[PDB]
Write a structure and sequence with these properties.
The structure is a homodimer.
Chain A lengths: L11 E6 L1 H10 L5 E6 L11 H4 L3 H10 L15 E5 L4 H17 L1 H6 L2 E4 L4 E5 L2 E5 L2 H8 L8 E2 L8 H9 L6 E3 L5 H12 L4 H10 L5 H21 L9 H11 L10 E2 H11 L6 H11 L9 E4 L18 E4 L4 H4 L29 H4 L3 E3 L4 E3 L5 H13 L5 H4 L13 E2 L3 H10 L1 E7 L1 E5 L2 E6 L6 H14 L5 E6 L9 E5 L6 H9 L5 E7 L1 E3 L5 E3 L2 H40 L3 H10 L4 H8 L3 H8 L8 H26 L1 H18 L11
Parallel strand pairs in A: 1-2, 1-3, 3-4
Antiparallel strand pairs in A: 4-8, 5-6, 5-7, 9-11, 10-11, 12-13, 14-15, 15-20, 16-17, 17-19, 18-19, 21-22
Helix pairs in contact in A: 1-7, 4-10, 8-10, 11-12, 16-21, 16-26, 21-24, 21-25, 23-24, 25-26
The structure holds the ligand COc1c(N2C[C@@H]3CCCN[C@@H]3C2)c(F)cc2c(=O)c(C(=O)O)cn(C3CC3)c12 (2 copies) and magnesium ion (MG) (4 copies).
The first copy, chain A, binds a DNA duplex (26 and 26 nucleotides) through helix 4, helix 10, helix 13, strand 12 and strand 13.
DNA sequence: GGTCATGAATGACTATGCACGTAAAA
DNA sequence: TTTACGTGCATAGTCATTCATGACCT
């Protein structure tokens, strides 16, 4: 009956997204004829689930029990409500859930939208306040519509239902006599059921990819497609996929940038995690804080990140149990020194900047990597229509690669592979794939590679000291003892996890007699436990072109170098265009230092003395002021000859620079040197060796 | 051995056990909380040391019966883990050689060790007696003088280490969660370098005598008194240790947690929040900003504690229906009066400061408050706020410490500003006379205060007492319309209370209860009687004694006063004592602005002195090696005034900017005069403060909401 | 053909310290 | 008399399910 959680055509059920809007709407509603219900989290994709299974999922079950109908049942006779309304966020995840919702309907309750009982409530994206003359904007288009028409107006963005007070909620989406509200119409089944299948078919993701690259009342179909597209593109671009420059997803950059702006350089002390995350949401990334903090754990985990961006203090998980990390109220962290490579050149105008979600700040669109992080750190996420997996690589190995690629851009992949053989993982276990096939993986982006734990033999016990990337010692001990219980192995006596401060890993497997052929047991285990494991390779990522591509290893390096060339440039432009504007001021200054007396005369003698100084010395608006802002202490003969040498340095530094810009070839040497440098600073030897 | 049928309890599993089965080579660390769990589980030596999280504060078992003790799951696992039966000397099956209490080196950590000792002293004496109980002492600090580390258990040992000490960098271990495995290992776990006290239960009498005194839900009396009275290389006594430890806790939670200070009238979690909000510049005139950033900053730099706990104490200050005068203004879902705890999660909401809040904060940048080092000496925080008004009696506080608590009803601003303006002039005002001004509480509701005056005054002159409130209703036909509920009574609870009577045939005289409420009508509970002939007066003056439509309210004017000590204080007393605080605050402020005006006046002096012979000024700098001494000797002006001239921008050499700095001399000269009169003359000060109260009781004031009534 | 796991997105439950006065009962 | 309530500020692990996809698994 739904207790607690929860004429007849005058009635309307309000299905809102999440316990926030739950409380709010339940308030906002008109008690007489408006019932409320939170849909909590994303509901299951029902499009391929049997009406009978569909009710097994509780949050789904509850909707049926509420509307008083049944999945795959024409029996609308007990229908509890006149109008059923999908009350979602204004954001993407908002419309996604709605899409996931229409799906539960169109498929399992077609009858409903057929007779037209399904409505998508339309909450405002904005709220403007001219003097007191309120407006609401459902989107970007209407905002402009309203803006060219009026005191000066004051925007507020509605980043979602929970941050809207009930009074503005009722007026905009609840009370019928002001609520924007679409009557979604199914129409033909075939175009519909056809279109949504393409969309939510766990089997059909392939067409989706394409589709994207190709792509009052509204139609269920027209709408649930307009939405799901909005969704897809967002999670491809602005969530699950890295950009190539720095190799970072957005929550990833937003964290790392936020951490910079809280002054958390590696050289200093750590600061509570709550506050970093507290700032990340507060000003750049308004979503989960848990999600955030967890994405911030990964970056700080030695065993998950080949080159950590963050250095945590306290419990940040163990190699054995990554997810065992302590709550954010406990951990403190700062930045990794390796994160210098992503940030040190930020102040120096090397990056686009865009905004933040309320225009009150600006956040950088990418960071100025001094190295190609996307390959060293690598990534692993799932979007829509596509996903991405990218193996960590050795800094020094990849630097050589790029150094080579800079010099000779036609370098065969066969050659390149001689520089960057294979991923280099955070452990010492062996990467056991044939050269041939790794080269295939690299040249093709798609592929797969295997790792094998490392052992020796001692009597009737097998001694293991290295497990493969991301494999928990215990889970191995589990898998092993499972076969023992299943009695698939009658060969083993015990599995002792020795281990300590001295040996990070030390799993002893004890056979029966000093007569058994461990080789077989180990060879067997390899082919039945995680002591041997396979690893996905899908080099997808957003490229400089702003679009998602699956790229080669040589391609990725080539393209990156085009991004580093453009960066070092922006940067020299930056430094120069200051040295100029500055040498300019110096120039005019020691012009006054000649006739210093006149300047003082002109000042004491004149009302507006600025134009006098311009006419008299032939100096412009900008130099006139540098002089008027020259403290008396400066008139000293010392501090005079001092700003004459400062001209010397300045003017030489400038020549050195504009030569660098001028000459594509003396630039490459700069970038080649700046690679060779950091590979020295932050480089490390290989860990996971390569075998047969 | 054999294939038994009845089998023992599996083992807690949240126990991370050792592998070595020898009895004495073993040890169990009982660590406070899941973070310290994982970290200890890491630091420990797998072989002979097992680990087990205790999560939360375990129940106080000093009066729970051995049979009942295993009721409580968290207590169940300590018994199942050590393998021993409560109130039983049967140690013959005991799983570990040492039981080690490993808590935070904070106040709360010392409390969870006290409760733990109780559990043992009382239900496992045998164990404690055979000396199997131990207390690991994690260090509170790590000093890194050079390349050589030093650890200090507490403050005394930090004093010793640094005064013997090229610069020391100190680090506070705010608690185990944030230690790293290596550091934990070295300091608390690993035998050959760990500080580890053995606890002795050598004479039960003293001991159980003492623990009764602290841990018995009735002797709160003796605790209050006891408090006012007190303010393995080594072994200690369970009694020696738990007294030391329970006292630290009792002290801390009184002073630095539950009770408010008299000045601004806040508990620390509250003040730290509000300050943190100020420091984000979340001024009332400006836009709100995600709550998760406010709390993010609060635990980040001031209050090193739970974020939820903290966030929630923040919710309260935002709620129009619980704070008489909100200190925060909440945007988005912040609860309904009918479901106060229904508030959105913190990732959702944004909030800025109450306009009101300026009364606590406006005067902060102007040398009014003391400042103390935050918890890592990298920022400062105000010890109290410059409350312009007496917030403590306006908004009120409600809390429970140890050996005492504190309950304090909100009041009307205007009545209380009146009530003090009085006391400022007449410090002898009778309670009676003052009570004329401050008749009673003023709650965020329009329901009526139904306690006798004769009796409300006793509440005010003893600080202790009790007053009751009642809902406002009307009769229409055979239905009772209710519009005003008492302070903190939920419409729903009422409906529910009501239905329980119907449901148990105790009120067959009502056939329905409908809640009508809405935008235009805040509250309207309708009760639907049966016959129109029934006497609704009875119905209701029956309900008034069986639902919370008439509900009682606790008064206990306990707080920390200027003395830094807890007291219970008359309403009269409070305001008198508060005046002496605003006196001292206003003072402090005028000295601040003065001492800046003067320092400036001084600069202007030596300044227009140069304007005379400005040319000499220029030659002397152009002429000398270091011009400072010369200007000084030549113009007769000091090191300070010399620099000033030396930092005189050329634009100031214009005739305009000269006459200009003349005026400014005149301006200031007057201002400072007004100010020193005010300092100099006690009665002109009162006049000032008198004035500022009137201003504020105009600017942020309001009329009474809950009326006073007789029944 | 059917499961699994991967990291980013969409927070309410639950037990307990403490004082101590109201309320319902033995 | 006694036992069950409420109160705020302290001490987080658990739960479902999107989306893409290759390898177990059983
Ligand atoms: C886990 O302990 C808590 C419980 N209980 C649930 C647990 C189940 C196991 C045994 N009982 C405990 C008590 C609870 F109900 C609430 C909170 C809680 O709100 C909180 C916080 O920071 O807000 C922190 N904690 C823990 C960090 C102390 C809570
Ligand atoms: C209760 O919602 C969540 C569930 N449960 C909710 C669903 C219905 C009731 C319980 N069963 C499922 C799982 C869950 F398992 C995980 C998370 C979660 O991780 C999360 C976050 O912010 O990180 C937020 N939430 C809340 C925003 C919903 C989660
Ligand atoms: Mg949202
Ligand atoms: Mg989560
Ligand atoms: Mg603690
Ligand atoms: Mg809590």
């Amino acid at each position: 009956a739904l207790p607690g959680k929860l004429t007849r055509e005058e009635s309307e059920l309000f299905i809102v997204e999440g316990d926030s809007a739950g409380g709010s709407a339940k308030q906002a509603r008109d008690k007489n004829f408006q019932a409320i219900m939170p849909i909590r989290g994303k509901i299951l994709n029902t499009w391929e689930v049997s009406s009978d299974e569909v009710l097994a999922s509780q949050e789904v079950h509850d909707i049926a029990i509420a509307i008083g109908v049944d999945p795959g049942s024409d029996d609308l006779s007990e229908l509890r409500y006149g109008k059923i309304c999908i009350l979602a966020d204004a954001d993407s995840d908002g419309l996604h859930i709605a899409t996931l919702l229409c799906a539960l309907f169109v498929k399992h309750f077609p009858a409903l939208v057929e007779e037209g009982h399904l409505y998508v409530a339309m909450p405002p994206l904005f709220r403007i306040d001219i003097g007191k003359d309120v407006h609401y904007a459902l989107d970007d288009e209407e905002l402009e519509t309203i803006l060219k028409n009026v005191k000066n107006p004051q925007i507020t963005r509605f980043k979602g239902l929970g941050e809207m007070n009930a009074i503005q909620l009722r007026e905009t989406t609840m009370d019928p006599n002001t609520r924007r509200l679409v009557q979604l119409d199914l129409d033909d089944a075939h175009l519909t059921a056809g279109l949504l299948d393409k969309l939510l078919a766990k089997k059909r993701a392939a067409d989706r990819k394409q589709w994207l690259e190709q792509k009052e009342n509204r139609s269920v179909a027209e709408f649930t497609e307009q939405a799901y597209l909005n969704y897809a593109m967002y999670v491809i671009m602005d969530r699950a996929l890295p950009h190539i420059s720095d190799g970072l997803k957005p929550v990833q950059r937003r964290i790392v940038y936020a951490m910079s702006e809280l002054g958390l350089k590696s050289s200093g002390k750590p600061k509570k995690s709550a506050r970093t995350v507290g700032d990340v949401l507060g000003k750049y990334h308004p979503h989960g804080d848990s999600a955030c903090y967890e994405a911030m754990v990964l970056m700080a985990q030695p065993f998950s990140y080949r080159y950590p961006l963050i250095e945590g203090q306290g419990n940040w998980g163990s190699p054995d149990d990554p997810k065992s990390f302590a709550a954010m109220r406990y951990t403190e962290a700062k930045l990794s020194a390796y994160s210098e490579l992503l940030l040190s050149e930020l102040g120096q105008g090397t990056s686009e900047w865009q905004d933040n979600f309320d225009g009150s700040l600006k956040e950088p669109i990418t960071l100025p990597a001094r190295v190609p992080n996307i390959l060293l750190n690598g990534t692993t996420g799932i979007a829509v229509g596509m996903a991405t997996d990218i193996p960590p690589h050795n800094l020094r190995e990849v630097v050589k690669g790029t150094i080579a690629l800079i010099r000779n851009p036609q370098t065969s992949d066969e050659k390149l592979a001689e520089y960057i053989p294979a991923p280099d993982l955070p452990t010492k276990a062996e990467i056991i794939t044939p050269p041939e096939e790794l080269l295939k993986i690299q040249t093709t982006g798609r592929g797969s590679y295997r790792m094998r734990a490392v052992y020796t033999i001692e009597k009737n016990e097998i001694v293991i000291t290295e497990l493969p990337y991301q494999v928990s010692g215990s889970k191995v001990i589990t898998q092993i003892a499972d076969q023992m219980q299943a009695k698939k192995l009658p060969l083993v006596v015990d599995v002792r996890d020795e281990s300590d401060h001295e040996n990070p890993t030390r799993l002893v497997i004890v056979l029966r007699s000093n007569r058994i052929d461990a080789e077989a047991v180990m060879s067997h285990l390899f082919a039945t436990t995680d002591l041997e494991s396979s690893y996905r390779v899908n080099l997808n990522m957003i490229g400089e072109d702003g679009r998602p591509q699956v790229k080669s290893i040589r391609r990725i390096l080539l393209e990156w170098i085009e991004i580093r060339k453009k960066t070092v440039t922006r940067r020299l432009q930056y430094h120069l265009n200051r040295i100029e504007k500055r040498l300019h001021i110096l120039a005019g200054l020691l012009i006054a230092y000649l006739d210093i007396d006149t300047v003082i005369r002109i000042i004491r003698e004149e009302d507006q003395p600025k134009p006098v100084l311009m006419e008299h010395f032939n100096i412009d608006e900008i130099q006139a002021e540098a002089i008027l802002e020259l403290k008396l202490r400066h008139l000293a003969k010392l501090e005079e000859m001092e700003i004459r040498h400062e001209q010397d340095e300045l003017s030489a530094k400038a020549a050195i620079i504009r030569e660098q810009l001028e000459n594509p070839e003396s630039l490459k040497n700069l970038i080649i040197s700046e690679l060779k440098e950091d590979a020295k600073k932050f480089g490390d030897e290989r860990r996971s060796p390569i075998v047969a």
